[PDB]
């Protein structure tokens, strides 16, 4: 009856918001491109408070954390490639020959032995040097004259060879007065009212791995194998599937390469590819044929829920596009692999091996372009020795064509980050609350 | 006892959440947010630092102009206009949560903030006149 306003400071009520999220990492100390050394040390007690009785709305396709992480990683690469060598003197005429012929016909031009005149420490004296270059980094003139692939479109900057491309787990944290809400639902779609909800000061360890078609070293589902798209009935929205079991993949470049430094100026050194020690072999990836078929069947079962128990779905290879998107492109120990995936997506499944593995022939590039802008390209310096990385395929990036058929792709870097930030949501705290009660001042 | 944690009683009743306000009050300025290097992570963290103190003080500013400085539960002299919410006390504190309550009181939150503001200006003027003898 006699009710006055009563003010409460610290009321458990929040509103959706966009904020700046800083980075947290764990103690490991050289310096990765992700600059994880500059992040606040993560708490050894990753506190998670469960919000009983709460039911929050999520929408991974409007999430701001993925748009923020997309710009952060790009800025980390921009920040790391600023102080490194500009290879504009390399855009010169190249006299190229195949290196060590006689193997398997048109697989000898895949890597060339190119010699060229180069600036020295003295501005008035040239040097004739040579370097080994892959075929995907050179184009002909129309004679055996070649040039680097980027010379007409982009300037090129080689990465400072002391930096590490190895992804390091990044934790995203909201500032004080804000919060991160995680969706604990083990069969969560990506959108809609998530029943189980918990709050965290920081997100889990997210490795910033940029890969195509196949999502590597990511997180796994706890039940079934979810499939996430904003309009699955629309064929132009990428399907993001997420395995619960990891199908292992082994990639390698068996060629034992040597890095030869070339002084192109005062303080400037270009890291060329000396020669190949031992056999000139083919870089490739293995994946267990048994596990890939089993995991590809689970995707079929969950795809049935969106297209009918009777329909037939088929897997085909990429239908075109840029080289980065038509292949399983990724980074393995420094070099950028570009793996043919026609052997992984070549299956038709009906309405209703066991020993060997399926191999994937990969080509290798050194002059890789920036995905967003045009006119900006990086030179990956040559990695010495034999390369071999072992990682998990924990998801896919598929595409429907409109009985059913699904092919891979996905050149958008933020589709990678959606596969890890779908659980999280940024909200701001509003601790001021007014409510009636029979309490009066004085 | 219980101790649900930070926002642990977000789904509890308003009366039950009204007993764990220190749990949220202490995390409004701390966390993990020593040199200022202006890298991509350094600029990001600096903004995270200034943003926390900014929002923290804006709430303390309103809490000051209402005469509720350093209070978690202060009572006022602004009566409850039933047009704000005709719900009864028992169906408010033993029923609703603070989240859904703020959802329905949202229109009048700026109206109430003005009544608490001038009520404090006039109350301090009254206290000065009473101490003028």
């Amino acid at each position, epitope marked *: 009856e006699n009710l006055w306003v009563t003010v409460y400071y610290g009321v458990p009520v929040w509103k959706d918001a966009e904020t700046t999220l800083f980075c947290a990492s764990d103690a490991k100390a050289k310096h990765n491109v992700w600059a994880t050394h500059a992040c606040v040390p993560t708490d050894p007690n990753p506190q998670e408070i469960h919000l009983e*009785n709460v039911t*929050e709305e999520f929408n991974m396709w409007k999430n701001n954390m993925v748009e923020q992480m997309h710009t952060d990683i790009i800025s980390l690469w921009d920040q790391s490639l600023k102080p490194c060598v500009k290879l504009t003197p390399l855009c010169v005429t190249l006299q190229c020959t195949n290196v060590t012929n006689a193997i398997t016909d048109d697989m000898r031009g895949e890597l060339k032995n190119c010699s060229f005149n180069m600036t020295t420490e003295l501005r008035d004296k040239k040097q004739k040097v040579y370097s080994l270059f892959y075929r995907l980094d050179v184009v002909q003139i129309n004679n055996k004259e070649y040039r680097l692939i980027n010379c007409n479109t982009s300037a090129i900057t080689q990465a400072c060879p002391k930096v590490s491309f190895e992804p390091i787990p990044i934790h995203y944290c909201a500032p004080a007065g804000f919060a991160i809400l995680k969706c604990k639902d083990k069969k969560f779609n990506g959108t809609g*009212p998530c029943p189980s909800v918990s709050t965290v000061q920081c997100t889990h360890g997210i490795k910033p791995v940029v890969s195509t078609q196949l999502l590597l070293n990511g997180s796994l589902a706890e039940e079934e194998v979810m499939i996430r798209s904003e309009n699955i009935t629309n064929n132009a929205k990428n399907i993001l599937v997420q395995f619960n079991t990891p199908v292992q993949i082994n990639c390698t470049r068996p060629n034992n390469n040597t890095r030869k430094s070339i002084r192109i100026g005062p303080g400037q050194a270009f890291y060329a590819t000396g020669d190949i020690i031992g056999d000139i072999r083919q870089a490739h990836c293995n994946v267990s044929k048994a596990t890939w078929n089993e995991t590809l069947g689970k995707v079929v079962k969950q795809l049935r829920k969106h297209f009918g128990n009777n329909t037939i779905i088929r897997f085909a290879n990429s239908s075109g596009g840029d080289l980065e998107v038509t292949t399983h492109s990724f980074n393995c120990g420094g070099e950028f692999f570009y793996c043919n995936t026609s052997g992984l997506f070549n299956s038709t499944w009906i309405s209703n091996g066991s020993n060997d593995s399926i191999t994937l022939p990969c080509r290798i590039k050194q002059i890789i372009n920036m995905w967003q802008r045009i006119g900006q390209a990086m030179y990956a310096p040559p990695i010495q020795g034999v390369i071999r990385c072992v990682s998990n395929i924990t998801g896919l990036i598929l595409t429907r064509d409109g009985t059913e058929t699904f092919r891979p792709g996905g050149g958008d870097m933020r589709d990678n980050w959606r596969s890890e930030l779908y659980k999280y949501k940024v909200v701001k705290i509003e601790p001021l609350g007014v409510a009636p009660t029979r309490c009066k001042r004085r | 006892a219980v101790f649900l944690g930070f926002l642990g009683a977000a789904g509890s009743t308003m009366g039950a959440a009204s007993m764990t306000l220190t749990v949220q009050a202490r995390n409004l300025l701390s966390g993990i947010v020593h040199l200022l290097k202006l890298t991509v992570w350094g600029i990001k963290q600096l903004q995270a630092r200034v943003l926390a103190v900014e929002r923290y003080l804006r709430d303390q500013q309103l809490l000051g102009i209402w005469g509720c400085s350093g209070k978690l539960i202060c009572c006022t002299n602004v009566p409850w206009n039933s047009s704000w919410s005709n719900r009864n006390l028992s*169906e408010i504190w033993d*029923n609703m949560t603070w*989240l859904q309550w703020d959802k329905e009181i949202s229109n009048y939150t700026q109206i109430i903030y003005g009544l608490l503001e001038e009520s404090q200006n006039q109350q301090e003027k009254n206290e000065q006149d009473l101490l003028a003898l």
Partner: nanobody
Amino acid sequence: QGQLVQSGATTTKPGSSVKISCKTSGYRFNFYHINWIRQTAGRGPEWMGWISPYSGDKNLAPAFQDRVNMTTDTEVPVTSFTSTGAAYMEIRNLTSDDTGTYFCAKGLLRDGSSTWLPYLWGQGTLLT
């Protein structure tokens, strides 16, 4: 708001065991108890029992102590504060003297002294 639609009003004969459903909407099904009330013609209206759609805890009268099974299945999040639920009712050593109209009503408040009190009722079902 809040709605509680009940099952059909079909009839059986003594010795059997019928199931009564109660489907909820417009409110969080977990936040309030679910009561079962009987309005017999040859007796005053009787409270049969309530159950917790959140904690599963049930409480029925000693007259129905070992004769009734009360069950509810987990809700379905519709919005942040809305969900759909269902409550079930069974009878064991059943006769024809248990004839009448049966209702389902949800609790009153989420806390206090009148927590489980039957507040919002259904349209009822006729029996044998």
